[PDB]
Design a protein around this ligand. Structure first.
Ligand SMILES: [Mg+2]
Ligand SMILES: [Zn+2]
Ligand SMILES: [Zn+2]
Ligand SMILES: [Zn+2]
Ligand SMILES: [Zn+2]
Lengths: 1232, 652
RNA sequence: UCCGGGGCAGAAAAUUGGGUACC
RNA sequence: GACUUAAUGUCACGGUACCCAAUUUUCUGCCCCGGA
């Protein structure tokens, strides 16, 4: 009589603000949320309130369940027949109800004996309230024969506590892009999901029908339900202010952004990365320690202060502490640096007819429950607006895109997202569906909406709350092949392999083959790949879910309906339904044995199966691959400046993230390489904008208006177990052009995956091609696949240095002599007795004339006039070559006997000897810049002398490094590029082919090694003796066999020179041959000629490479094997000769069979690189540095070759000292 | 200053977009770029922006909405926001003199269009007061500013006197005929002089495509005249409808505008009110108005944005239509064989009264009767909702629909309106296309079907009426094997007919004008674009657009389809229904007669239809419906459901 | 009047721009 | 109680936060004269 019922929600139910019926029309949000749980503001201030559900909404759901219950039983219930009720109020007789029914009404052949009236009414007319004193206008509660009171939440209460504002979406099926959106409040069902209310029934004739309908009400307020009858943030902000102020005091403000990114990333590592001091400690000897974690904030290192902060802010937990501190550091950084929509925001909120639907008498209606798990085969992303925006009641971003989570931070698959993707695939399976019209007066009777109205899903939440990995994406500038300005954003993505509890309820008369097809389409089984594209970022392969462990059960609703109501349709107990066996099934629920198989489904085979065609292939990288993850490099104990990207993969079997992160090339990088590869060949990349554009690139890869027709997945490394050391440590350094030593700040290292030609990395990746791909576009993707296979587009960073060069692609089955002779120099040739002594290094004073080309060559296309191709070169070692492997400071395992003595092996990857392409590129860059009179790209401006001006002031202004493309780029900076312009030449790693493997020396403990003399940093004070002196030029080292002196005095070197003062290193023998690949794009006929000339200058001219250049080591001669160009033809020698001549002609223009020696700067440059002992020659010039004084070690008696005497201005005045240093091969013991 | 250069960049981009020579593709980009330059500095400066720069914000906002064409039936929310966004900044110029003169000039026109596209936010009284102050502010420079004439003329629509201002604008050079005709009607109550000027407007309307603003304005003017009891809309609605016919004749698709249906409803109503031979000449003119409305179907802009001789010809129509939308702001009806009667149906949205125009060739008499389609449509929706759920089990809902067809349309059984033995050709309108008019029960005890007395043929429109091999019977088939076996391998079928799995190109292959063509496949309906509706044949299927161009052989062929029309056309969510099925696509490419089922029936019923057509093609379909199974509708209603499902589309 | 010494070990830039309102 | 429903009519499970963007660009693991 006075039923008190409790209504419980089993998924996040929608909430809306309460507005009176007349005041509701003014607000679109509340009119849309008329079937939601109403929120009213208690008190004032719009802060707290009380959540409730209108009894009219519970009544509408109940009388809807009475309709279905009576329709299922053909108008009867437990023997008492019921008429069709009434659902039409004439406007003339009385006013309309507050809510009009747009939906079809289930009706039946009425079998009640008499027409229902006030005296005698059927249980349906009792529950409707057709004949009782209660009417459209409420007067008193006693008038209601059946009364539904308001349902107050069982738990003032803040809106933000109970509900979270979320933006839902309407995605256009044809374009794949959101048509519009709308915001709701998804209230918390776990804490505020129980609503209690009183149903007062004053006619017991409908008691049995009413109580059954309460158990038949499946969903309410947007959520499945069962109806049963019964500041830390402010303190973190202040100390983040402290951090930013400290960084500003250290003039490292730009490091605050990277620190904020690293701190937010620290949530992944956990408490132990701070409380165990697991952060990288920096270099072993560096006074400054780590460049970021050891920045002293207030007299203490940043790691220690982070430990103190964690101790202070332990209450909020590690994840909240790192998210807030990372955000607070971001928030403050934005206000320290700085930081409206036209046409408004596309936030859209949406004659009555009675349509009686009469199911045929005797039809059998069933409810099919499909319970499985949605396994994320790819890193999923369910988009959500920023937490500042996603605040209910009130309507800077550290993370540009946030994934959707719970109050408990568990990853969430929304019912809306699962329904929208199911509707998308149902429309695909049917082949015909509607663009969902909102607020239409007539139910959409399309084949999709008909099934969607019978389909109910669940809000799936993973039992996994670890923080999301951040994917950074950039946009390449097509013209410069660098990052587009302002194009750097991060996305929170959930781990792949994460399982979500999938629930699908279909209540109907027959199970459609289209829903079976979609379920089969989403299923993963044996060879099939699950194809449940859920959520956003599908083009970057985010959210390819797979349905697994699918059990389809059947509710016989015509016979076993009392049991269905008793079990409440297994609502909220669906996870129990998945684990439970067929013997433990609830009464009336039976497994669906007639679930059509995958190949027996007509909609699946023509509509869903061919929709996305996978193209799986194995990228084979024969180079060290580095898809840099700088943020994760700061937080990992390696202390490497750049480390390879790795992803967190969730193992469903172990119910945890796999201990070893999966190394992969991100799908975004995988996608972007293709988009560039297709764009550059079709010229679409060069288009200024792509708004309302239907070009080849925009049709394939989508644009702001159309979704991509191709979805790219990550290139997972499937070779991790093969490599003994997967990640190679490669040190890099920028050598000053003026002084052959390292720059002040420019020294770094990378941690790429240790790929090599003999042991390449295999990156198995795949992309999905949409059905209906044009034949021309299918060729475009294949051509892009060929471009990457040919090695045009290296993967990851440092491509021009030789990183990530693709050796080949394996598609899965399921789919020349340069005969120039330089005359040399007179002094070394005349002195056949080698009496005179030469300075080891010499300076090339080309001059201040630098030709800066303001017309920068765009990377956005393969220009037909310009030359793009590849050079195959052989590098022969004329003298022993030293390329030390700095990954192991004790690579020779001899530091134990000599502590602190730095010993390295020859540079190698996976045990095969190498020359890094950076070494080749850098050594070729200095020669090219010297040849072309380019700027001093790497130069120590900040260094001083011992004075009035720094070296930058003494250097000519035109010789200064090119900054920005506005002023133009010098030929060296135009070829090899700058920070603003990616270089057009790529140098690969040089693989060792043949020759005497090592220079064996018996005295050395390792026979293949050699202990060098002390190599001290170049000091400009000698080259610039006085303030009136200028920069002498670019330092170059003469080719000589001075290594023999080092080789023959190995015992004396070790016994006298301090062990830590010098190094021991594995040195190659002369005649060793290395082969490296030089890939060039968009080269002039002269630029390729100059590059070809730079590689192989002449017969008796070589380069200086690697360690020990002043000691005669590293004289390497580069020989061109083959030059290949494409528009892939093999350019012959005659055409190569043509290219080189044009480079000579271009050098003539700048000056104002080519004999290079006529040009004064090249002649000076070429005698520097001329090899006196090359071919057949008896010249053995004595080239070494002067000793400090006569008493210094190594001084030879009978000679005045000392720095004390040469440094003295009386014997050697400053002008002739610089005159000597400028002139190559000038004798220095008998000083010229 | 910085603001001076800002406008110098933004005030010349707008005029570059404001000129008519700029293409709409470029114009939208130009306005957005200028607005980005303009609004971008508004974000930086907020109220620091001067009134002159605040003036030009609304100019971009007014112009940006011009490029926001309606992508569907309703006016866009984005276009409404731009007008709302524009009316904000220009209002900011009023509270913050050549500045005020031009401020009220653009504040008012933005509200004029705001009141036009959305009258609820910008009320008529609110709009009246706004432009009334323009008289107070003296926005009466009608010689130089086009917008200025719009102001004094939108005002007299509201009811403002403006007797003094008449002397200026009618002699103003830049006042168009429609505006001049308006200013001649309600500024001074001289209905006579509005006839000549509006005639020039309607005469000039024969060349401006239907997307032009003048088309919507001229119908709105007659919308004002109609209901004013001015006795002048009757002549005017007919006159402009004539201009629509000339303009529309230049794929059988037309530009969609909301006033187009009102134009034809008002022209139809004008003739109906004006309704011996002259008296019957109007009644015939009702059919020509009705036929012209169904001669082509309106395509929503979003549908034509996404669709090659047909392709090349269509893009010209799409380009020409979009340019004109932005330009303004910146067979015989009696040629029927003897013994046939033709019933042209027209549904009036103006008044909830549909009416059927009938032409008895033997009597050479034109007459019409009106019927209430409001209640019949609800009964149709009840059948449509029940059929889509239960198919043949909704037969009981078809009978009450067919009885409702007889009940609300009793003239179909009246001998004077339709003779007892005369063949009836149906030309339905809107939801009557889905109605089984042939099988309708007369509203009387044991009422016989309409189909029993007359053989009924259907035509999407009278414009589809058209005027060789007598032993070649081709059969296409992509249906499942188990449904058609004994019919599949009959001896009559020709060699050029793939009888197990048919392809889209093989349909294009049939030549020599066969007597019978059978296509048995699963049709699929594009719910928005009729051109994209396909007959699923092998891989991909062949669409309405593809059938129009690719298929050429079946000229005069009697076509039989195996795909239900409910799968060929989308379900009806409204009274209007212009989504033409694949059957009429065949009708355009000759194919005299296209017999197909109106809804899903068991494959045996289609089998018997084909086999009975195989024996003698000259047999009337009506006889098969009554002599085999159907015409019962009382005992075993699904049998009546299965038979009546077959209609004959297309009459030669 | 004195007989030796290691350096750099990352620097610069991008850290988000926008688009999307069928009914 | 109210806050906070209207009752012969709530398809809002009537709507995927969707769509675009290569963590990348440049850099030789390099090297000699002094220091008070
Ligand atoms: Mg009542
Ligand atoms: Zn009753
Ligand atoms: Zn629909
Ligand atoms: Zn494009
Ligand atoms: Zn440069």
């Amino acid at each position: 009589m006075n039923i008190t019922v409790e209504l419980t929600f089993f998924e996040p139910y929608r909430l809306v603000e309460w507005f009176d019926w007349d005041a509701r029309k003014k607000s679109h949000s509340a009119m849309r949320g008329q079937a939601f749980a109403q929120w009213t503001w208690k008190g004032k201030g719009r802060t707290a309130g009380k959540s409730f559900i209108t009894g009219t909404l519970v009544r509408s759901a109940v009388i809807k369940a009475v309709e279905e219950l009576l329709s299922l039983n053909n108008g009867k219930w437990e023997g008492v027949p019921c008429c069709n009720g009434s659902f039409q109020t004439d406007e003339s007789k009385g006013k309309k109800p507050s809510f009009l029914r747009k939906r079809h009404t289930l009706q039946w052949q009425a079998n009640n004996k008499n027409i229902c009236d006030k005296e005698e009414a059927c249980p349906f007319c009792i529950l409707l309230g057709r004949f009782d004193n209660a009417g459209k206008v409420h007067e008193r509660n006693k008038d209601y024969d059946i009364h539904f009171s308001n349902f107050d939440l069982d738990h003032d209460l803040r809106l933000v506590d109970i509900a979270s504002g979320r933006i839902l979406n309407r995605v256009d099926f044809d374009t794949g892009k959101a048509k519009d959106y709308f915001r709701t409040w998804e209230a918390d069902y776990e804490t505020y999901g129980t609503y209690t209310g009183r149903i007062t029934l004053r006619n017991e004739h409908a008691k049995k029908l009413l109580l059954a309908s309460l158990g038949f009400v499946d969903k309410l307020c947007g959520a499945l339900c069962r109806i049963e009858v019964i500041d830390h943030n402010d303190e973190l902000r202040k100390q983040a202010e402290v951090i930013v102020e400290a960084f500003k005091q250290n003039d490292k403000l730009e490091k605050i952004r990277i620190l904020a990114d690293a701190i937010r990333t620290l949530r992944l590592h956990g408490e132990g990365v701070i409380e165990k001091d697991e952060l990288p400690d920096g270099k072993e000897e560096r006074d400054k320690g780590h460049h970021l974690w050891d920045i002293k904030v207030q007299g203490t290192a940043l790691r220690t202060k982070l430990k103190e902060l964690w101790q202070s802010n332990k209450d909020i937990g590690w994840r909240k502490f790192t998210e807030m501190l990372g955000s607070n550091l971001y928030l403050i950084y934005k206000k320290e640096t700085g930081g409206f929509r036209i046409l408004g925001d596309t936030e859209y909120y949406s004659s009555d007819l009675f349509i009686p639907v009469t199911p045929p008498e005797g039809i059998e209606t069933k409810e099919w429950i499909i319970v499985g798990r949605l396994k994320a085969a790819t890193p999923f992303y369910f988009g959500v607006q920023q937490p500042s925006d996603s605040i209910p009641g009130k309507e800077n971003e550290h993370t540009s895109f946030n994934i959707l989570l719970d109050k408990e931070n568990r990853y969430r698959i929304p019912r809306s997202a699962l329904r929208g993707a199911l509707r998308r695939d149902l429309r695909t399976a049917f082949g015909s569906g509607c663009n969902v019209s909102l607020g239409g007066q007539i139910l959409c009777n399309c084949k999709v909406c008909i099934e969607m109205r019978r389909i109910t899903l669940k809000d799936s939440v993973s039992d996994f709350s670890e923080p999301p990995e951040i994917r950074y994406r950039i946009a390449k500038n097509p013209g410069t092949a660098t990052v587009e300005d302002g194009s750097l954003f991060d996305i929170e993505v959930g781990p792949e392999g994460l399982t979500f509890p999938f629930v699908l309820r279909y209540r109907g008369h027959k199970f459609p083959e289209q829903l079976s097809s979609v379920i089969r389409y989403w299923e993963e089984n044996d060879g099939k790949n699950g194809m449940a594209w859920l959520g956003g970022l599908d083009s970057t392969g985010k959210g390819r879910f797979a349905l697994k462990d699918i059990k389809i059960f059947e509710w016989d609703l015509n016979q076993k309906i009392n049991e269905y109501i008793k079990e409440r349709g297994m609502r909220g107990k669906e996870k129990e339904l998945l684990e439970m066996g067929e013997s433990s099934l609830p009464d009336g629920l039976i497994p669906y044995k007639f679930f059509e198989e995958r190949e027996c489904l007509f909609p699946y085979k023509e509509n869903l199966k061919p929709q996305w065609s996978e193209v799986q292939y194995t990228i084979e990288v024969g180079s060290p691959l580095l898809t840099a993850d700088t943020i994760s490099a700061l937080t990992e104990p390696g202390n490497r400046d750049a480390i390879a990207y790795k992803k967190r993969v969730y193992n469903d079997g172990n119910n945890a993230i796999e201990p070893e992160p999966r190394f992969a090339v991100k799908s975004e990088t995988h996608r972007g390489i293709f988009r560039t590869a297709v764009g550059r060949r079709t010229g679409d990349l060069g288009k200024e904008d792509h708004e309302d554009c239907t070009c080849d690139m925009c049709i394939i890869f989508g644009n702001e208006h159309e979704s991509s027709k191709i979805r790219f997945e990550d290139l997972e490394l499937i070779n991790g177990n093969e490599f003994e050391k997967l990640e190679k440590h490669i040190d890099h350094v920028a050598i000053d052009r003026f002084t052959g030593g390292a720059l002040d700040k420019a020294k770094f290292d990378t941690y790429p995956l240790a790929g090599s030609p003999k042991k390449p990395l295999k990156l198995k990746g795949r992309f999905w091609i949409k059905k209906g791909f044009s034949g021309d576009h299918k060729l475009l993707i294949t051509t892009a696949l060929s471009d990457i296979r040919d090695g045009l587009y290296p993967l990851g960073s440092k491509g021009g240095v030789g990183y990530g060069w693709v050796a080949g692609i394996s598609i899965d089955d399921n789919v020349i002599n340069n005969d120039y002779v330089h005359p040399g120099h007179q002094s070394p040739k005349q002195d056949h007795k080698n009496k005179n002594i030469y300075y080891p290094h010499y300076f090339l004073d080309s001059g201040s004339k630098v030709y800066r080309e303001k017309d920068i060559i765009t990377h956005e296309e393969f220009t037909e006039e310009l030359l793009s191709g590849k050079i195959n070169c052989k590098l022969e070692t004329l003298t022993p070559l030293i390329i030390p492997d700095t990954s192991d400071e004790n690579g020779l395992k001899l530091q134990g006997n000599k502590p602190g003595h730095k010993n390295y092996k020859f540079f190698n990857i996976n045990g095969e000897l190498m020359i890094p392409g950076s070494e080749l590129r850098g050594m070729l860059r200095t020669h090219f810049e010297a040849l072309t009179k380019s700027c001093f790209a790497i130069f120590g401006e900040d260094s001083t002398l011992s004075a009035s001006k720094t070296l930058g002031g003494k250097l000519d202004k035109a010789l200064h490094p090119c900054t920005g493309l506005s002023d133009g780029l010098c030929p060296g900076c135009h070829l090899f590029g700058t920070t603003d312009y990616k270089g057009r030449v790529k140098f690969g790693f040089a693989k060792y082919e043949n020759g005497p493997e090592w220079l064996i020396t018996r005295g050395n403990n390792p026979e293949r090694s050699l202990t060098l003399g002390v190599l001290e940093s170049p000091r400009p004070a000698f080259s610039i003796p006085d303030d009136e002196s200028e920069i002498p030029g670019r330092k170059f080292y003469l080719h000589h066999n001075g290594w023999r002196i080092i080789r023959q005095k190995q015992l004396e070197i070790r016994e006298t020179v301090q062990p830590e003062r010098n190094v021991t290193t594995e040195v190659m023998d002369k005649g060793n041959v290395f082969s490296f690949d030089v890939r060039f794009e968009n080269l002039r006929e002269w630029e390729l000629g100059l590059l070809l000339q730079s590689l192989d200058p002449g017969k008796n001219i070589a380069h200086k490479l690697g360690k020990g250049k002043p000691y005669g080591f590293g004289s390497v001669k580069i020989k061109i094997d083959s030059l290949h160009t494409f528009k892939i033809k093999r350019v012959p020698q005659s055409d190569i000769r043509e290219y080189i001549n044009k480079g000579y002609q271009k050098l003539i223009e700048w000056s104002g069979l080519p004999q290079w020696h006529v040009i004064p700067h090249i002649d000076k440059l070429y005698k520097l690189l001329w090899v006196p002992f090359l071919n057949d020659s008896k010249l053995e010039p004595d080239v070494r540095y002067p000793v400090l004084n006569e008493e210094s070690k190594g001084y030879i008696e009978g000679s005045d070759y000392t720095y004390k005497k040469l440094g003295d201005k009386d014997n050697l005045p400053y002008k002739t000292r610089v005159k000597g240093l400028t002139t190559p091969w000038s004798p220095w013991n008998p000083f010229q | 200053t910085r603001e001076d250069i800002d406008r110098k960049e933004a005030e010349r981009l707008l005029d570059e977009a404001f000129n008519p020579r700029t293409k709409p593709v470029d114009r939208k980009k130009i306005i957005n770029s200028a607005l980005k330059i303009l609004i971008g500095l508004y974000k930086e400066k907020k109220d620091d922006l001067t009134s002159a720069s605040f003036i030009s914000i609304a100019r971009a906002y007014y112009l940006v909405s011009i490029t926001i064409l309606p992508k569907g039936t309703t006016i866009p929310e984005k276009k409404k926001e731009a007008l709302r966004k524009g009316i904000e900044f220009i209002d900011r110029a009023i509270n913050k003199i050549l500045d005020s003169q031009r401020a009220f000039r653009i504040k008012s026109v933005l509200s004029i269009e705001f009141n036009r596209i959305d009258r609820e936010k910008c009320d008529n009284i609110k709009l009246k007061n706004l432009l009334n102050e323009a008289v107070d502010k003296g926005c009466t420079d009608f010689d130089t500013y086009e917008w200025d004439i719009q102001i004094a003329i939108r005002l007299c629509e509201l009811g403002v006197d403006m007797e003094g201002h008449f002397d200026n604008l009618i002699k103003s050079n830049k006042a168009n005929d429609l505006q001049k005709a308006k200013a001649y009607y309600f500024i001074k109550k001289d209905d006579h002089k509005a006839k000549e000027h509006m005639d020039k407007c309607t005469a000039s309307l024969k060349y401006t495509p239907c997307s032009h603003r003048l088309w919507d304005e001229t119908v709105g003017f007659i919308e004002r005249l109609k209901g004013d009891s001015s006795t002048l809309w009757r002549d005017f609605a007919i006159k402009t409808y004539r201009s629509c016919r000339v303009q529309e004749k230049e794929l059988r698709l037309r530009w969609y505008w909301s006033r187009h249906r009102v134009l034809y409803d008002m022209a139809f109503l004008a003739v109906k009110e004006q309704a011996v031979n002259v008296k019957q000449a109007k009644i015939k003119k009702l059919a020509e108005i009705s036929d012209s409305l169904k001669s082509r179907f309106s395509l929503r802009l979003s549908d034509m944005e996404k669709m090659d001789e047909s392709n090349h010809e269509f893009k010209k129509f799409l380009d020409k239509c979009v340019t004109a939308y932005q330009d303004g702001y910146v067979l015989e009806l009696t040629q029927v064989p003897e013994g046939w009667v033709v019933v042209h149906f027209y549904l009036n949205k103006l008044e909830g009264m549909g009416n059927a125009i009938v032409f008895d060739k033997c009597a050479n008499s034109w007459q019409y009767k009106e019927f209430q389609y409001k209640e019949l449509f609800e009964v149709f929706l009840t059948w449509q909702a029940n059929y889509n759920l239960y198919k043949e089990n909704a037969a009981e809902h078809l009978v009450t629909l067919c009885k409702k067809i007889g009940e609300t349309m009793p003239f179909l059984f009246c001998d004077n309106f339709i003779p007892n033995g005369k063949d009836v050709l149906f030309v339905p309108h809107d939801f009557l296309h889905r109605l089984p008019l042939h099988g309708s029960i007369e509203n009387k005890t044991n009422g016989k079907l309409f189909l029993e007395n007359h053989s009924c043929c259907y035509l999407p429109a009278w414009s589809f009426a058209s005027e060789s091999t007598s032993d070649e019977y081709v059969l296409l088939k992509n249906f499942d094997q188990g449904h058609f076996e004994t019919l599949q391998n009959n001896q009559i079928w020709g060699t050029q007919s793939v009888k197990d799995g048919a392809s889209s190109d093989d349909l294009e292959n049939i030549r020599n004008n066969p007597r019978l063509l059978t296509i048995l496949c699963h049709g699929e309906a594009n719910m928005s674009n009729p051109f994209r509706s396909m007959l699923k044949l092998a891989n991909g299927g062949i669409t309405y657009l593809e059938i129009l161009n690719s298929v050429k052989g079946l000229k005069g062929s009697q076509v039989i389809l195996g795909a239900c029309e409910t799968d060929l056309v989308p379900p009806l969510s409204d009274v209007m229904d212009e989504h033409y099925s694949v059957a009429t696509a065949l009708l355009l490419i000759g194919a005299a007669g296209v017999v197909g089922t109106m809804w899903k029936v068991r494959s045996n019923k289609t089998k018997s239809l084909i086999e009975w057509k195989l024996e003698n093609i000259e047999y009337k379909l009506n006889e098969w419906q009554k002599e085999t199974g159907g015409a019962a509708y009382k005992d075993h209603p699904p049998t009546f459901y299965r038979s009546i499902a077959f209609r004959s589309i297309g009459f030669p």
